[PDB]
Amino acid sequence: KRRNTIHEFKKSAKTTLIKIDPIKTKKVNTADQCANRCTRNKGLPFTCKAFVFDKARKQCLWFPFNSMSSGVKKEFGHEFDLYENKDYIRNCIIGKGRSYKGTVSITKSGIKCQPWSSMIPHEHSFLPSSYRGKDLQENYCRNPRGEEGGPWCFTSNPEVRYEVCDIPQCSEVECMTCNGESYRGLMDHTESGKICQRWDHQTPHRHKFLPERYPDKGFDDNYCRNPDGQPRPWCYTLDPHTRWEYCAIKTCADTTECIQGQGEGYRGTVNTIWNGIPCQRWDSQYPHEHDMTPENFENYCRNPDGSESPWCFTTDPNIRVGYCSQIPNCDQDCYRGNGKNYMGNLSQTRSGLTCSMWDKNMEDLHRHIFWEPKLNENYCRNPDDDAHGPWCYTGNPLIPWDYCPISRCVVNGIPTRTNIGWMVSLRYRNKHICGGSLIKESWVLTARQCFPSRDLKDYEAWLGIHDVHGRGDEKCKQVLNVSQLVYGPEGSDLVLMKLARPAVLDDFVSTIDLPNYGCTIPEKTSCSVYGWGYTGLINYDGLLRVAHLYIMGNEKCSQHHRGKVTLNESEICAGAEKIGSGPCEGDYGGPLVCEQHKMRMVLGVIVPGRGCAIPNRPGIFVRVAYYAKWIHKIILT
């Protein structure tokens, strides 16, 4: 007929075997058919101890040797899969042990077995030729007839002809725990002696458990498992008629108030549901019988099945299951901008790093700043009363301090006549993206919204150019790699760049001075913005383009927005001269510079928002003075 026997094989994943001193390959779609061929008597002239298949190869190859055979090399081959004969691995007895291949050649009496090839001193040794595929080895004792006694061999001792070898059963080593799911052993035989089908298979049972879908539970070939929390493991029967059967295993040898998890490992003497109705004991099936029994694993609210909440059957007959949902499970500032007002129990930073050793922190802070002469080590509380919120020193050599995250309450472009070195062209993917402002010999600032990537090996800085790629002045353009970028405080949306190597200053290139921290701007104060970005022209020659800007307060902006934006002190509003002109795409991070009397100085940073220069609509920029002290603190690095 046409049968299947791979259910008696083992299986390993992503492995293959190579014998250095040796076996044929055929194109077969089904590896199961190959395993059946290997078991099927006479199918292979050699003694097929193992089989190997690759789905990509679709190639089928049998090995007349086991992984235990000497001189074999295991290779971790993803496409190749191994199928071992478990009989050689069984090393125990199932039933009569008909197909026993154990490498045992001794009797209970301790006399060496008579070899099955030599008929001395006893001549009933024609069996090596009588029974094909029964694997009676040179001297190891088998059960050629499947006789009830077990593996018996002839003794070289003359007086006794044959004696049954004492070889243990398989139930001897496989013990059992009450939960059952923890157990993962070698039994693949049901309680009635049936064999568990392959959990990888879908025949003859189209069950639910899929080993790759449900790993971590030992969904191996046929070894019994307890997926549904039964008192014992069970498996689907290889018989199509029998749905499933239990596995016979002997047993092994040798609480709080807060809720951890969903109550699985939790035990609780509380057994009152949110309705206040108590629950009955596990022995008392009243009112309606409950399947669970103490033998499977009081009148308490436990979780035998591991539901979301522990459940106990209500004394009310109508409600089968009641969940004690009142159980508790084990699981920031406002108007105080100064962190001294709140004792922040937080050892973390905004970047997520832990803090540093507060002794060296106090030492370095006092040495660096002597503002005033307390708090606890390694916590969100700060001594400096920083307006941007509480912070904490960090152990990172690159950055020694970071804020701790606690909540607390150019369109119509006119080209520039000359070149200005305050601009920095953000070069990523070998092209301009955004504008940056140069503060120090090794410091630039721009908007956070100009960094698609968080790495640095792709970005690039180009400086000292009047055109988009310096098409005019190749003699003085300079290129510099980025060494570090730092995100600004919460909601700031500003980033600071220190380059791989500071650029020596020159007439063209310029570093820019910073605003007075407490300064305020008069209304209608005209200033300038510079950009390479989108201007709406038919052809952008890439030349630097300048525009003039004028200050307006919260009001005129708000009515121009018709209440769209509620302005904040973090923000500065300034609009054009009733003409259509302003920053657009490609100009993000651009600087707005103004002078007290003569020395011009940056007041704003171009930030993306609310369209490109709608006529008679002011634009919004950052308050550089809103962070100037914070920049002065960070410049310590």
Binding site: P215, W274, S325, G352, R454, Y534, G609, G611
Partner: protein, 699 residues
């Protein structure tokens, strides 16, 4: 009797005329903005009045002529050759961050979208401005940026992050159409300030299935929303590359302008488990909202803790369609977030199947810092696929397990919450939600043959003026959430089961609002028992026989339950027997001169004056002679022979087969006896022993 009193329950069908509007073509999406509701329908777009329910204006993206050389918005009017296809709007959104704008999207035009503006003086014109978001990617024509809408499946979420408009789109696409136009299953399109195109910020800004499986592994996105700076997607797919089954999942990722950094998927199942199990695989509709206060206790949350409600239907065996069997299941955001972050251990986590591939180096030896990292954006991100699913139980306990729910919306009223269920047939209902027990539908009427669209809009201003907009087939309807009427209630129990916000009260004959009683006897606290029928109406003070009492409102009125112990039945001074096993709030059984019967439930009492005190009597039989074989009809006569249930007429212990029983004449055929002599006949009315005239045998 039970069916004879079918007038007990609420009349499931009674027609209402609601504010409604009919469409010429099927409608796909709906948008509400400033008392104007925009309806994208097959090839068309409409604007509808909030109160007037009148079409202010409309515009046609009519039958589409397609040419293989023709681009989505290049002029092709002069083309005299070709397909004649039809665009349908899967992606419709209103944006107000920049300007009052409508972004519509057609199915056929390479999935390209259009933009429309509103003047301030007239905030309803849409034909005034038409704008294709079609930017020619001269830089990299390998990827089409503005090619967004997949014709097979689309789910679009628009948001404002970092002062940019971001579109998280999940697109279901077949492998066949990929070479024609490159698309990505999940992508984030960020709007240019010029409003003329989109840029893919980076390569890791999009995630899509490997090309080989783009024919298998069907992933259909059904919902998306935002919470706690996370974008969640509810979508269906196979259990595994091999399972061929189907189950829905939640997808979370961190909304950074760059792209999806922390990408997590987790499988969701809702199961009906009983003492000593049905699993719903396919999500049908979803809606996130704030919870009811009683539900806040019942699930352990605050009045602001956002909860997601999902309609789950069991999938066909190895198929994505349901068996018309649906349930509703609730999921707090806090619990799912915690399950994503902390509850799941390390080794259960796996690599993405469709993205990573099993035979690739990442999920070979890469792990997670789950307990020490949340939403952190690291450049070498690790896409994770949890194998541990989250199970929840139907709060209706399968009250709709026999029917399919096509859509769902939610709202709250005081302490309680009401869900606006939509039935597969199109039977819109409103039901109060509670873990206490199954809830009677205070409205259940059938709307249309077509199924209710998953597109549903809710609104409740001031917690007084409330209404929902529901699409079905080619008609949209505005149904107020303030109820419709109390008259449909046909029992005191049903009338009182109504929510307080609808003024329902039994006016001694039927449920009605307080002001509408002419008799002024409006009541909302007691249920007087009502008798429908009594079987039979005649029994002696000692004679006892089965007595069936059909009626309504017999049980004591309790909040949810209706007890029978708080009831007595009396025959005047004498008390009629109570058989609580066969006695319900609906039917009762008793086994005991005209007399009345007084039934006093837990609230009231009612008298029934039809019972009478009689006793069957016998006058004569016919004939008196009969052969040995018997088989002779006895025209037995008498009075009260039709009182009581049953009669045993037998001779010599052998039953005289009863053919007809009336009040005046009885008929039975004698059996074959054993002797031939003069014998009498015995009659039984189960207690009234009666002898009759003797009947003589012959032979």
């Amino acid at each position: 009797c039970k069916e004879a009193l079918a007038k007990s329950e609420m009349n499931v069908n009674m027609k209402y005329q609601l504010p409604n509007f009919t469409a010429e073509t099927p409608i796909q999406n709906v948008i509400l903005h400033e008392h104007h509701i925009f309806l994208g329908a097959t090839n068309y777009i409409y604007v509808l009045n909030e109160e007037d329910l009148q079409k202010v204006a409309e515009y046609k993206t009519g039958p589409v002529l397609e040419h293989p050389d023709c681009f989505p918005c290049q002029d092709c009017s002069s083309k005299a050759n070709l397909v004649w296809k039809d665009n349908i709007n899967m992606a419709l959104v209103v944006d107000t961050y920049y300007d009052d704008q409508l972004i519509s999207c057609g199915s056929v035009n390479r999935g390209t979208c259009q933009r429309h503006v509103f003047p301030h003086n007239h905030t309803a014109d849409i034909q005034s401005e038409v704008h294709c978001i079609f930017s020619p990617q001269i830089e990299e024509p390998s990827q089409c940026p503005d090619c967004v809408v997949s014709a097979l499946g689309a789910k679009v979420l628009s948001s404002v992050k970092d002062r940019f408009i971001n579109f998280f789109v999940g697109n279901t696409i077949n492998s066949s159409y990929f070479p024609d136009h490159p698309l990505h299953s999940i992508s984030v399109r960020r709007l240019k300030e010029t409003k003329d195109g989109f840029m893919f910020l980076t390569d890791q800004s999009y995630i899509d299935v490997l090309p080989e499986f783009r024919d298998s592994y069907p992933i259909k996105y059904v919902h998306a929303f935002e919470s706690n700076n996370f974008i969640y997607f509810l979508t269906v797919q196979r259990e595994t590359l091999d399972a061929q089954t189907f189950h829905t999942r939640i997808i979370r990722f961190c909304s950074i302008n760059s792209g999806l950094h922390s990408y997590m998927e987790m499988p969701l199942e809702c199961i009906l488990t009983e003492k000593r199990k049905e699993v719903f695989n396919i999500l049908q509709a979803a809606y996130v909202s704030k919870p009811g206060a009683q539900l806040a206790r019942q699930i352990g949350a605050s009045l602001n803790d956002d909860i997601l409600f999902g309609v789950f239907a069991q999938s066909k065996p190895d198929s994505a369609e349901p068996m018309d069997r649906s349930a509703m299941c609730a999921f707090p955001i806090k619990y799912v977030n915690d399950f994503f972050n902390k509850i799941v251990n390390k080794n259960n986590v796996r690599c993405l199947q469709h993205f990573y591939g099993p035979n690739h180096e990442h999920c070979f030896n890469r792990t997670l810092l789950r307990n020490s990292s949340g939403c952190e954006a690291r450049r070498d991100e690790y896409r994770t696929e949890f194998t541990t699913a989250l199970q929840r139980v139907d709060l209706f306990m399968g009250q709709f397990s026999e029917v399919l729910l096509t859509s769902i919306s939610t709202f709250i009223k005081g302490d309680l919450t009401i869900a606006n269920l939509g039935t597969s047939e199109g039977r819109f209902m409103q039901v109060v939600v509670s873990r206490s027990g199954p809830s009677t539908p205070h409205v259940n009427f059938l709307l249309d043959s077509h199924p209710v669209s998953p597109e549903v809009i809710v609104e409740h201003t001031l917690n007084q003026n409330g209404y929902t907009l529901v699409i079905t087939g080619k008609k949209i309807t505005k149904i107020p959430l303030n109820g419709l009427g109390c008259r449909h209630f046909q029992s005191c129990s049903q009338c009182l089961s109504a929510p307080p916000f609808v003024q329902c009260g039994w006016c001694h004959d039927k449920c009605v609002r307080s002001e509408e009683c002419l008799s002024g006897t409006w009541t909302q606290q007691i249920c007087l028992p009502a008798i429908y029928k009594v079987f039979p109406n005649s029994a002696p003070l000692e004679g006892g026989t089965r007595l069936t009492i059909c009626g309504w409102d017999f049980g004591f009125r309790r909040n949810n339950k209706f007890d029978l112990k708080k009831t007595r039945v009396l025959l005047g001074n004498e008390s009629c027997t109570l058989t609580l096993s066969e006695s319900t709030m609906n039917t009762l059984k008793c086994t005991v001169f005209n007399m009345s019967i007084i039934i006093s439930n837990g609230h009231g009492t009612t008298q029934y004056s039809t019972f009478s005190y009689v006793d069957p009597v016998i006058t004569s039989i016919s004939p008196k002679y009969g052969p040995m074989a018997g088989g002779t009809l006895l025209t037995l006569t008498g009075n009260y022979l039709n009182s009581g249930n049953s009669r045993h007429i037998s001779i010599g212990g052998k039953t005289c087969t009863l053919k007809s029983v009336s009040n005046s004449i009885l008929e039975c055929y004698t059996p074959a006896q054993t002797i031939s002599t003069e014998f009498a006949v015995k009659l039984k009315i189960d207690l009234a022993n009666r002898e009759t005239s003797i009947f003589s045998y012959r032979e």
